[PDB]
Amino acid sequence: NTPLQAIGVPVALYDALMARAIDSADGTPNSKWLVTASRDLDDGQAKEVKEGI
Amino acid sequence: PAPSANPAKIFIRRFFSAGVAKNVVSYSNVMAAQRAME
């Protein structure tokens, strides 16, 4: 007769949630500004736009 | 002292039967008490 009899469910839930957290911590890109050019921009001046930004 | 004649004899007539060793708690209640401990 121990408390561990009745805490399997919440401890399992807790570790599953924390695994979700640690997993998504490393794996979601940390960049902003998804910048995209058009399909006529002459790579050779497209790069100038990248360096300028 | 003790008069030995209580009005609790309604039940042994037909609702119950003498000398049978009936259990005190329904099995459903036992199983309910068991899983209520986990």
CA distance A12 to chain B (A): 15
CA distance B36 to chain A (A): 10
With beta carbons less than 8 A apart as the criterion, state whether A37 and A49 touch.
yes
What is d(CA A28, CA A48) in angstroms, rounded to the nearest whole number? 28
**How many inter-chain contacts (A to B, CB under 8 Å) are there?**
5
Resolution stated for this PDB structure, in Å: 3.5
Helices (H), B1-38: 27-35
Verify whether the Cβ–Cβ distance B38 to A1 is below 8 Å.
Answer: no
Q: How many residues does chain B have?
A: 38
What is d(CA A11, CA A46) in angstroms, rounded to the nearest whole number? 53
> Diameter of chain A by CA atoms?
75
On chain A, the residues whose CB falls within 8 A of the CB of B37 are 1, 5-6
What is d(CA A26, CA B33) in angstroms, rounded to the nearest whole number? 46
